[PDB]
Amino acid sequence: LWIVDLNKSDLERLGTSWSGSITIGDKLGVSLNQSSISTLDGSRFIAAVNALEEKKQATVVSRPVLLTQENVPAIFDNNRTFYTKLIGERNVALEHVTYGTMIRVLPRFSADGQIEMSLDIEDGNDKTPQSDTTTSVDALPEVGRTLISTIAR
Amino acid sequence: LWIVDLNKSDLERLGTSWSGSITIGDKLGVSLNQSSISTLDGSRFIAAVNALEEKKQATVVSRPVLLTQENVPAIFDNNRTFYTKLIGERNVALEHVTYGTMIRVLPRFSADGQIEMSLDIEDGNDKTPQSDTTTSVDALPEVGRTLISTIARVPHGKSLLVGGYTRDANTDTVQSIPFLGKLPLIGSLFRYSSKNKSNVVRVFMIEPKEIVDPLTPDASESVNNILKQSGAWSGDDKLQKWVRVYLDRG
Amino acid sequence: MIEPKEIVDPLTPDASESVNNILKQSGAWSGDDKLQKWVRVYLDRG
Amino acid sequence: VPHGKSLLVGGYTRDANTDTVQSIPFLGKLPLIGSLFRYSSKNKSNVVRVF
Amino acid sequence: LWIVDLNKSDLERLGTSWSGSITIGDKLGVSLNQSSISTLDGSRFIAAVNA
């Protein structure tokens, strides 16, 4: 089984954006492109400049191989388990999630010499959110999977 | 059973990346490539430079061996247990996980002299996250396993490929400043470029054979040559020879 | 993508012959050891 | 087993060999100064268990 | 029943690895091979040597 995965990207930012507050002689104040002025009263004007130009490319080719006989169900599995500590009192348990590549096939020869298969394919990996925020240390592995169930000959 | 595992890698980063804030005369401030400016108002510009060039290679060949008879299920197991303390109040328990190499086979001779087997192979190990963060001290051993269940039929002395896995990858990024990145001799301080490459191969192979003769030389003769060569032999002791003469009678 | 095929012959060369070329090339081979050859002579009989 | 002879029941072998090489891209190729920027490691193991 | 267990190993590390921060005149700062710069702003360059 072949799993081909390609990517490509492009990005360009260039320009400024003005947003700030001011205080003019302790009797009148001027804001600019804001909503809250009071908690930013002692601050100044901000001219946020952006300049970037990015290219990207990524190829991934993965391939599992499995050998079996006629009319015999076989399983290839390459997974990853994530254990968490649910601190209860009664039905304390180690709960776990599982994600990875998995094939379950049931081959069979036809009358002409063709091979009919009953497939159950799963290909998952771990999507990562932003590492700087607190939710990277708790039990949040956002899992993205891809499931296919069909019959081909 | 043969388990061959190969790796290869490549990596190169070279370039800078500007991201910082400034304050100009307590009336206007300029940011650059940021989102939050207020909590980084007292800071300065940062020019993060990267320079690296890495190669890598790793081979691992593991092999379990097991002996049994016709039509008899046998088990080889080499595992590791991880015990955790679920501090409950009622159904307090020591919960455990288990991972390791494991074979369960059921051999059988066919009419021609070939050996058909009913296999159940598991090969797992412990994947490690980053050691600097707090989740390395709690009960999080991220386990990665590999399961194969099939039926194969090999002649006597030959071999077959049961499982397998390959993976190839190649990524590359290029960043720059739009106008300053094209200067002749100054523009190298603003570009950035990375690369990556990997090639992984895992296979599982089966090689059965038939045993008709015992070991030659004997098991008690090959051990006495190991103890004499490594220096751990103590059959010449004055005190322990009064009791070791019963066990080493043959 | 799916690509099936039928297997009628065993591996050529053998599985124990392609591994001995990997261990000699990568430098992980230890079949010439003075101490471990007393026990590895049972497993590498073929 | 016959009387007095022996048989090998179980077994396990494992061989490994890793090696990494790191450097600075330009400073790592200097003749007599470039040794302060390279890095290189090795590893090897051979385990045998029998029953 | 005989249980024979043998081992062997080898290891060699030799080289340096540069990773540190700096502050140049309280208006611009230079990092090197790092991710966090702010909590290591008052520190210096580190040349970790292994032998």
Coordinates of C-alpha atoms in Angstrom, one line a residue:
Chain A
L1 CA 0.0 0.0 0.0
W2 CA 1.4 3.4 -1.0
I3 CA 0.6 6.6 0.8
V4 CA 1.9 9.7 -1.1
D5 CA 1.6 13.1 0.6
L6 CA 2.8 16.3 -1.0
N7 CA 2.6 20.0 0.1
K8 CA 3.5 23.4 -1.2
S9 CA 3.0 26.9 0.2
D10 CA 3.7 30.6 -0.3
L11 CA 3.3 33.7 1.9
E12 CA 4.2 37.4 1.8
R13 CA 3.4 40.3 4.2
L14 CA 4.5 43.8 3.7
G15 CA 3.1 46.9 5.4
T16 CA 2.4 48.8 8.6
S17 CA -0.7 49.2 10.9
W18 CA -1.2 52.1 13.3
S19 CA -3.0 51.6 16.6
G20 CA -2.4 53.6 19.7
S21 CA -3.5 56.2 22.3
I22 CA -2.2 59.6 23.4
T23 CA -2.8 62.2 26.1
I24 CA -2.8 65.9 25.2
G25 CA -2.5 68.3 28.2
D26 CA -4.6 66.3 30.8
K27 CA -7.9 67.6 29.4
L28 CA -8.4 65.8 26.1
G29 CA -7.1 62.5 24.7
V30 CA -7.1 61.0 21.2
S31 CA -7.4 57.3 20.4
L32 CA -6.8 55.6 17.1
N33 CA -8.3 52.2 15.9
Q34 CA -8.9 50.9 19.4
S35 CA -11.8 49.9 21.7
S36 CA -10.3 50.3 25.2
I37 CA -8.5 53.5 25.9
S38 CA -8.4 53.7 29.7
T39 CA -6.1 50.7 30.4
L40 CA -3.9 51.9 27.5
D41 CA -3.9 55.6 28.6
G42 CA -0.3 55.7 29.7
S43 CA 0.9 54.1 26.5
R44 CA 1.8 55.6 23.1
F45 CA 1.2 55.1 19.4
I46 CA 2.3 51.7 18.0
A47 CA 3.3 51.2 14.3
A48 CA 3.4 47.4 13.9
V49 CA 5.5 46.7 10.8
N50 CA 5.5 43.3 9.0
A51 CA 8.0 42.0 6.4
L52 CA 8.2 38.4 5.4
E53 CA 8.4 36.2 2.3
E54 CA 8.2 32.5 2.7
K55 CA 8.4 29.4 0.5
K56 CA 7.8 25.8 1.5
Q57 CA 7.7 22.2 0.2
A58 CA 7.3 18.8 1.8
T59 CA 7.0 15.3 0.4
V60 CA 6.3 12.1 2.4
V61 CA 6.0 8.6 0.9
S62 CA 5.1 5.8 3.3
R63 CA 4.6 2.1 2.5
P64 CA 3.4 -0.8 4.6
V65 CA 3.9 -4.4 3.3
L66 CA 2.0 -7.5 4.5
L67 CA 2.0 -11.1 3.5
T68 CA -0.9 -13.6 4.0
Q69 CA -2.7 -16.5 2.3
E70 CA -6.1 -16.8 0.5
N71 CA -9.2 -16.3 2.6
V72 CA -7.2 -15.4 5.8
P73 CA -7.6 -12.1 7.5
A74 CA -4.3 -10.4 8.3
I75 CA -3.4 -7.2 10.3
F76 CA -0.5 -4.8 10.1
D77 CA -0.5 -2.2 12.8
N78 CA 2.0 0.6 13.7
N79 CA 0.5 2.7 16.5
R80 CA 1.3 4.9 19.4
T81 CA -0.4 5.0 22.9
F82 CA -0.9 8.0 25.1
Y83 CA -1.6 7.3 28.8
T84 CA -3.3 9.8 31.1
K85 CA -4.0 9.9 34.8
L86 CA -7.7 10.5 35.6
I87 CA -7.4 11.1 39.3
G88 CA -10.7 9.7 40.6
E89 CA -11.6 7.8 43.7
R90 CA -13.6 4.7 42.8
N91 CA -13.2 3.5 39.2
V92 CA -9.6 4.8 38.9
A93 CA -8.3 3.9 35.5
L94 CA -5.5 4.5 33.0
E95 CA -7.3 5.8 30.0
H96 CA -5.5 5.8 26.7
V97 CA -5.8 6.9 23.1
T98 CA -4.3 5.2 20.1
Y99 CA -3.3 6.4 16.6
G100 CA -1.2 5.1 13.8
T101 CA -1.1 3.2 10.5
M102 CA -3.3 0.1 10.3
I103 CA -4.4 -2.3 7.5
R104 CA -6.8 -5.2 7.7
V105 CA -7.2 -7.1 4.5
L106 CA -9.0 -10.3 3.3
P107 CA -7.6 -11.4 0.0
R108 CA -9.3 -13.8 -2.4
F109 CA -8.5 -15.0 -5.9
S110 CA -11.3 -14.7 -8.6
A111 CA -11.8 -17.1 -11.5
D112 CA -9.8 -15.1 -14.0
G113 CA -6.7 -14.6 -11.8
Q114 CA -7.6 -11.2 -10.3
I115 CA -7.3 -10.5 -6.5
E116 CA -10.3 -9.1 -4.7
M117 CA -9.7 -7.4 -1.3
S118 CA -11.8 -6.2 1.6
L119 CA -9.9 -3.2 2.9
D120 CA -9.9 -1.3 6.2
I121 CA -7.3 1.4 6.1
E122 CA -6.4 3.9 8.8
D123 CA -3.6 6.5 8.7
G124 CA -3.4 8.9 11.6
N125 CA -0.8 11.2 13.1
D126 CA -0.5 13.8 15.9
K127 CA -1.4 17.4 15.2
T128 CA 0.4 19.9 17.4
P129 CA -1.1 23.2 18.7
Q130 CA 1.0 26.2 19.8
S131 CA 3.8 25.1 22.2
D132 CA 3.9 28.4 24.1
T133 CA 0.5 28.1 25.7
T134 CA -0.3 26.0 28.8
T135 CA -2.4 23.3 26.9
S136 CA 0.8 21.6 25.7
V137 CA 1.5 20.0 29.1
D138 CA -1.9 18.4 29.7
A139 CA -3.6 15.5 28.0
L140 CA -4.4 17.2 24.7
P141 CA -2.9 15.4 21.8
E142 CA -5.2 16.6 19.0
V143 CA -5.3 13.5 16.8
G144 CA -6.2 13.7 13.1
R145 CA -7.1 10.4 11.3
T146 CA -8.0 9.2 7.8
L147 CA -10.3 6.2 7.4
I148 CA -11.2 4.3 4.3
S149 CA -13.4 1.2 4.0
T150 CA -14.2 -0.3 0.6
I151 CA -13.8 -3.3 -1.7
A152 CA -11.6 -3.3 -4.8
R153 CA -10.4 -5.9 -7.4
Chain B
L1 CA 12.7 -14.3 13.3
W2 CA 14.8 -11.4 12.0
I3 CA 13.9 -7.8 12.7
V4 CA 16.0 -5.4 10.7
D5 CA 15.8 -1.7 11.3
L6 CA 17.7 1.0 9.4
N7 CA 17.7 4.8 9.5
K8 CA 19.3 7.8 7.8
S9 CA 18.9 11.5 8.1
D10 CA 20.2 14.9 6.9
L11 CA 19.6 18.5 8.2
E12 CA 20.9 22.0 7.4
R13 CA 19.7 25.4 8.7
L14 CA 21.4 28.7 7.8
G15 CA 20.0 32.2 8.2
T16 CA 18.6 34.8 10.5
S17 CA 15.1 35.9 11.5
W18 CA 14.3 39.4 12.9
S19 CA 11.5 39.8 15.5
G20 CA 11.4 42.6 18.1
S21 CA 10.0 45.8 19.5
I22 CA 11.3 49.3 20.1
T23 CA 10.2 52.6 21.8
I24 CA 10.9 55.9 20.1
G25 CA 10.7 59.0 22.3
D26 CA 7.7 57.8 24.5
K27 CA 5.1 58.9 21.9
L28 CA 5.3 56.3 19.1
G29 CA 6.6 52.7 19.0
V30 CA 7.5 50.4 16.2
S31 CA 6.9 46.6 16.2
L32 CA 8.2 44.0 13.8
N33 CA 6.8 40.6 13.0
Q34 CA 4.9 40.3 16.3
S35 CA 1.4 40.0 17.8
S36 CA 1.9 41.2 21.4
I37 CA 3.8 44.4 21.8
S38 CA 2.7 45.6 25.3
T39 CA 4.4 42.8 27.3
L40 CA 7.5 43.1 25.1
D41 CA 7.6 46.9 25.3
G42 CA 10.7 47.2 27.4
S43 CA 12.6 44.7 25.2
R44 CA 14.6 45.2 22.0
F45 CA 15.1 43.8 18.5
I46 CA 16.1 40.1 18.4
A47 CA 18.1 38.6 15.5
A48 CA 17.8 34.9 16.0
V49 CA 20.7 33.2 14.0
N50 CA 20.7 29.5 13.2
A51 CA 23.7 27.5 11.9
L52 CA 23.7 23.7 11.8
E53 CA 24.6 20.8 9.5
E54 CA 23.8 17.3 10.8
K55 CA 24.2 13.7 9.5
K56 CA 22.9 10.5 11.1
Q57 CA 22.7 6.8 10.7
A58 CA 21.5 3.9 12.8
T59 CA 21.2 0.2 12.3
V60 CA 19.5 -2.3 14.6
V61 CA 19.3 -6.1 14.0
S62 CA 17.4 -8.1 16.6
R63 CA 16.6 -11.9 16.5
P64 CA 14.5 -14.1 18.8
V65 CA 14.9 -17.9 18.6
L66 CA 12.4 -20.4 19.9
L67 CA 12.2 -24.2 19.8
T68 CA 9.0 -26.4 19.9
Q69 CA 7.4 -29.5 18.5
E70 CA 4.7 -30.2 15.8
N71 CA 1.2 -28.9 16.6
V72 CA 2.2 -27.4 19.9
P73 CA 1.8 -23.6 20.6
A74 CA 4.9 -21.9 22.0
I75 CA 5.5 -18.5 23.4
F76 CA 8.7 -16.3 23.5
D77 CA 8.2 -13.1 25.5
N78 CA 10.6 -10.3 26.4
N79 CA 8.7 -7.4 28.0
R80 CA 8.8 -4.5 30.4
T81 CA 6.2 -3.5 33.0
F82 CA 5.5 0.0 34.2
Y83 CA 3.7 0.3 37.5
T84 CA 1.7 3.4 38.5
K85 CA 0.0 4.5 41.7
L86 CA -3.7 5.4 41.1
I87 CA -4.5 7.0 44.5
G88 CA -8.2 6.2 44.9
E89 CA -10.1 5.2 48.0
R90 CA -12.2 2.1 47.2
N91 CA -10.9 0.0 44.3
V92 CA -7.2 1.0 44.9
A93 CA -5.1 -0.9 42.4
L94 CA -1.7 -1.1 40.9
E95 CA -2.3 -0.5 37.2
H96 CA 0.3 -1.5 34.7
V97 CA 1.3 -1.4 31.0
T98 CA 3.4 -3.9 29.2
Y99 CA 5.5 -3.6 26.0
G100 CA 8.1 -5.8 24.4
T101 CA 9.0 -8.4 21.8
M102 CA 6.6 -11.4 21.7
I103 CA 6.1 -14.4 19.3
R104 CA 3.3 -17.0 19.5
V105 CA 3.7 -19.7 16.8
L106 CA 2.0 -23.0 16.0
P107 CA 4.1 -25.0 13.5
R108 CA 2.9 -27.9 11.4
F109 CA 4.5 -30.0 8.7
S110 CA 2.7 -30.3 5.3
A111 CA 2.7 -33.3 3.0
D112 CA 5.7 -32.1 0.9
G113 CA 8.0 -31.2 3.8
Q114 CA 7.2 -27.5 4.1
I115 CA 6.4 -25.9 7.4
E116 CA 3.2 -23.8 7.8
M117 CA 3.0 -21.4 10.8
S118 CA 0.3 -19.4 12.4
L119 CA 2.1 -16.2 13.6
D120 CA 1.3 -13.5 16.2
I121 CA 4.2 -11.0 16.3
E122 CA 4.5 -7.9 18.5
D123 CA 7.6 -5.7 18.6
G124 CA 7.2 -2.6 20.8
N125 CA 9.5 0.0 22.5
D126 CA 9.3 3.2 24.5
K127 CA 9.1 6.5 22.7
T128 CA 10.4 9.4 24.7
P129 CA 9.1 13.0 24.6
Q130 CA 11.2 16.0 25.6
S131 CA 12.9 15.5 29.0
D132 CA 12.9 19.2 30.0
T133 CA 9.2 19.5 30.5
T134 CA 7.2 18.3 33.5
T135 CA 5.5 15.3 31.8
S136 CA 8.7 13.2 32.1
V137 CA 8.1 12.5 35.8
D138 CA 4.5 11.3 35.7
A139 CA 3.1 8.1 34.3
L140 CA 3.4 8.9 30.6
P141 CA 5.5 6.3 28.8
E142 CA 4.3 6.9 25.2
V143 CA 4.4 3.3 23.8
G144 CA 4.8 2.5 20.1
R145 CA 4.0 -1.0 19.0
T146 CA 4.0 -3.0 15.8
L147 CA 1.5 -5.9 15.4
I148 CA 1.4 -8.6 12.7
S149 CA -1.0 -11.5 12.5
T150 CA -0.9 -13.8 9.4
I151 CA -0.2 -17.3 8.1
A152 CA 2.8 -18.3 6.0
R153 CA 4.2 -21.5 4.6
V154 CA 8.0 -21.8 4.1
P155 CA 10.1 -24.8 2.9
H156 CA 12.7 -26.3 5.2
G157 CA 15.7 -23.9 5.4
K158 CA 14.4 -21.2 3.2
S159 CA 12.8 -17.8 4.2
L160 CA 9.9 -15.5 3.6
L161 CA 9.2 -11.8 4.1
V162 CA 6.2 -11.4 6.4
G163 CA 5.9 -7.7 7.1
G164 CA 7.6 -4.4 6.1
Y165 CA 7.6 -0.6 6.2
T166 CA 9.4 2.1 4.3
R167 CA 9.2 5.9 4.6
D168 CA 10.9 8.7 2.6
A169 CA 10.7 12.5 3.2
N170 CA 12.2 15.7 2.0
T171 CA 11.1 19.2 3.1
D172 CA 12.7 22.6 2.5
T173 CA 11.7 26.2 3.4
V174 CA 13.0 29.6 2.3
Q175 CA 12.2 32.8 4.1
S176 CA 13.5 36.4 3.4
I177 CA 12.8 40.1 3.9
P178 CA 11.2 41.2 0.6
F179 CA 13.7 43.9 -0.5
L180 CA 16.7 43.6 1.8
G181 CA 17.1 39.9 1.0
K182 CA 18.3 40.5 -2.5
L183 CA 21.3 42.7 -1.7
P184 CA 24.7 41.4 -3.1
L185 CA 26.9 41.3 0.1
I186 CA 24.5 42.5 2.8
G187 CA 21.5 40.4 1.9
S188 CA 22.8 37.2 3.5
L189 CA 21.8 38.6 7.0
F190 CA 18.1 38.5 6.1
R191 CA 17.5 35.2 4.3
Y192 CA 16.8 31.9 5.9
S193 CA 16.7 28.3 4.5
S194 CA 16.2 24.9 6.0
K195 CA 16.3 21.3 4.7
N196 CA 15.4 17.8 5.9
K197 CA 15.6 14.2 4.7
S198 CA 14.9 10.8 6.2
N199 CA 14.8 7.1 5.0
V200 CA 13.4 4.4 7.3
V201 CA 13.3 0.7 6.6
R202 CA 11.8 -2.0 8.8
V203 CA 11.3 -5.6 7.8
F204 CA 10.3 -8.9 9.4
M205 CA 11.6 -12.2 8.1
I206 CA 10.9 -15.9 9.1
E207 CA 13.3 -18.8 8.7
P208 CA 12.2 -22.1 10.2
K209 CA 14.2 -25.4 10.2
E210 CA 14.0 -28.9 11.7
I211 CA 16.0 -30.1 14.6
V212 CA 17.1 -33.8 14.7
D213 CA 20.4 -33.7 16.7
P214 CA 21.4 -32.4 20.1
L215 CA 24.0 -29.7 20.6
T216 CA 27.6 -30.4 19.8
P217 CA 29.7 -29.7 21.9
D218 CA 27.6 -30.0 25.1
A219 CA 26.0 -27.2 26.9
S220 CA 28.2 -27.8 30.0
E221 CA 31.3 -27.7 27.8
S222 CA 30.7 -24.4 26.1
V223 CA 30.0 -22.7 29.4
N224 CA 33.3 -23.9 31.0
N225 CA 35.1 -22.2 28.1
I226 CA 33.2 -18.9 28.7
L227 CA 34.0 -18.8 32.4
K228 CA 37.7 -19.5 31.8
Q229 CA 38.1 -16.9 29.1
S230 CA 36.2 -14.1 30.9
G231 CA 37.8 -14.8 34.2
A232 CA 34.7 -15.6 36.2
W233 CA 35.6 -19.2 36.7
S234 CA 35.7 -20.5 40.3
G235 CA 35.9 -24.3 40.0
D236 CA 39.4 -24.2 41.5
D237 CA 38.3 -22.7 44.8
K238 CA 39.3 -24.5 48.0
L239 CA 36.1 -23.8 49.9
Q240 CA 33.4 -24.0 47.2
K241 CA 34.7 -27.3 45.6
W242 CA 33.1 -29.4 48.4
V243 CA 29.6 -28.5 47.2
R244 CA 30.2 -27.7 43.5
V245 CA 31.4 -31.3 43.0
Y246 CA 27.8 -32.5 43.2
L247 CA 26.5 -30.2 40.5
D248 CA 29.5 -30.6 38.1
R249 CA 29.4 -34.4 38.3
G250 CA 29.3 -34.8 34.5
Chain C
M1 CA -2.8 3.1 -3.9
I2 CA -3.0 -0.7 -3.7
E3 CA -0.7 -3.1 -5.5
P4 CA -1.1 -6.8 -4.8
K5 CA 1.0 -9.7 -6.1
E6 CA 1.3 -13.5 -5.7
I7 CA 4.3 -15.1 -3.9
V8 CA 5.5 -18.5 -5.1
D9 CA 9.2 -18.5 -4.2
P10 CA 11.2 -17.9 -1.0
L11 CA 13.7 -15.1 -0.6
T12 CA 16.9 -15.1 -2.6
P13 CA 19.5 -14.7 -1.1
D14 CA 18.6 -16.0 2.3
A15 CA 17.5 -13.9 5.3
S16 CA 20.6 -15.0 7.2
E17 CA 22.9 -14.0 4.4
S18 CA 21.6 -10.4 3.8
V19 CA 21.9 -9.7 7.5
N20 CA 25.5 -10.8 7.7
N21 CA 26.3 -8.2 5.0
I22 CA 24.5 -5.4 6.9
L23 CA 26.4 -6.1 10.1
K24 CA 29.8 -6.2 8.3
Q25 CA 29.2 -3.0 6.4
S26 CA 27.8 -0.9 9.3
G27 CA 30.4 -2.2 11.7
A28 CA 28.1 -3.8 14.3
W29 CA 29.3 -7.4 13.5
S30 CA 30.6 -9.4 16.5
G31 CA 30.9 -12.9 15.1
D32 CA 34.7 -12.8 15.5
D33 CA 34.6 -12.3 19.3
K34 CA 36.7 -14.6 21.4
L35 CA 34.2 -14.8 24.2
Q36 CA 30.8 -14.7 22.5
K37 CA 31.6 -17.3 19.8
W38 CA 31.1 -20.2 22.3
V39 CA 27.4 -19.5 22.4
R40 CA 26.7 -17.8 19.1
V41 CA 27.9 -21.0 17.3
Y42 CA 24.6 -22.6 18.3
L43 CA 22.4 -19.9 16.7
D44 CA 24.5 -19.4 13.6
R45 CA 24.6 -23.1 12.8
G46 CA 23.3 -22.6 9.2
Chain D
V1 CA 16.2 -34.5 25.0
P2 CA 18.2 -37.8 25.2
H3 CA 19.8 -38.8 28.5
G4 CA 22.9 -36.6 29.1
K5 CA 22.6 -34.5 26.0
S6 CA 21.3 -30.9 25.7
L7 CA 19.0 -28.6 23.7
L8 CA 18.7 -24.9 23.1
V9 CA 15.2 -23.8 24.1
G10 CA 15.3 -20.0 23.8
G11 CA 17.6 -17.2 22.7
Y12 CA 18.0 -13.5 21.9
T13 CA 20.7 -11.4 20.1
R14 CA 20.9 -7.7 19.3
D15 CA 23.5 -5.6 17.4
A16 CA 23.6 -1.9 17.0
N17 CA 25.8 0.9 15.6
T18 CA 25.0 4.6 15.5
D19 CA 27.1 7.6 14.6
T20 CA 26.3 11.3 14.4
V21 CA 28.3 14.2 12.9
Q22 CA 27.5 17.9 13.6
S23 CA 29.4 21.0 12.6
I24 CA 29.2 24.8 11.9
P25 CA 28.7 25.1 8.1
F26 CA 31.8 27.3 7.2
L27 CA 33.9 27.4 10.4
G28 CA 34.0 23.6 10.6
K29 CA 36.3 23.2 7.6
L30 CA 39.2 25.4 8.8
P31 CA 42.6 23.6 8.9
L32 CA 43.7 24.1 12.5
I33 CA 40.9 26.2 14.0
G34 CA 38.0 24.0 12.7
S35 CA 38.3 21.4 15.4
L36 CA 36.6 23.7 17.9
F37 CA 33.3 23.6 16.0
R38 CA 32.8 20.0 14.9
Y39 CA 31.2 17.2 16.9
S40 CA 31.1 13.4 16.4
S41 CA 29.7 10.5 18.4
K42 CA 29.7 6.7 18.1
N43 CA 28.0 3.7 19.7
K44 CA 28.1 -0.1 19.5
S45 CA 26.6 -3.0 21.5
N46 CA 26.3 -6.8 21.2
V47 CA 24.0 -8.7 23.5
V48 CA 23.5 -12.5 23.7
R49 CA 21.1 -14.4 25.9
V50 CA 20.4 -18.2 25.6
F51 CA 18.5 -20.8 27.6
Chain E
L1 CA 19.0 -25.2 33.2
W2 CA 21.8 -22.8 31.9
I3 CA 21.2 -19.1 31.5
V4 CA 24.1 -17.4 29.7
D5 CA 24.2 -13.6 29.3
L6 CA 27.0 -11.7 27.6
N7 CA 27.4 -8.0 26.8
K8 CA 29.8 -5.7 25.0
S9 CA 29.9 -2.0 24.3
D10 CA 31.8 0.9 22.9
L11 CA 31.4 4.7 23.0
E12 CA 33.3 7.8 21.9
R13 CA 32.3 11.5 21.9
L14 CA 34.6 14.4 20.9
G15 CA 33.7 17.9 20.0
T16 CA 32.0 21.1 21.0
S17 CA 28.5 22.7 20.6
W18 CA 27.8 26.4 20.8
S19 CA 24.5 27.7 22.2
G20 CA 24.1 31.0 23.9
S21 CA 22.7 34.6 24.0
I22 CA 24.2 38.0 24.2
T23 CA 23.2 41.7 24.6
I24 CA 24.8 44.4 22.5
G25 CA 24.3 47.9 23.8
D26 CA 20.7 47.6 25.1
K27 CA 19.2 48.1 21.7
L28 CA 19.8 44.8 19.8
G29 CA 20.6 41.3 20.9
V30 CA 21.9 38.2 19.1
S31 CA 20.9 34.6 19.9
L32 CA 22.5 31.4 18.6
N33 CA 20.8 28.0 18.3
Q34 CA 18.1 28.7 20.8
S35 CA 14.3 29.0 21.1
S36 CA 13.9 31.1 24.3
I37 CA 16.0 34.2 24.6
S38 CA 14.1 36.3 27.2
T39 CA 14.7 34.0 30.2
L40 CA 18.4 33.6 29.1
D41 CA 18.9 37.3 28.3
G42 CA 21.3 37.9 31.2
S43 CA 23.4 34.9 30.4
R44 CA 26.3 34.4 27.9
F45 CA 27.6 32.0 25.2
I46 CA 28.1 28.4 26.3
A47 CA 30.6 26.1 24.5
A48 CA 29.7 22.6 25.8
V49 CA 32.7 20.4 25.3
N50 CA 32.5 16.6 25.4
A51 CA 35.4 14.1 25.6

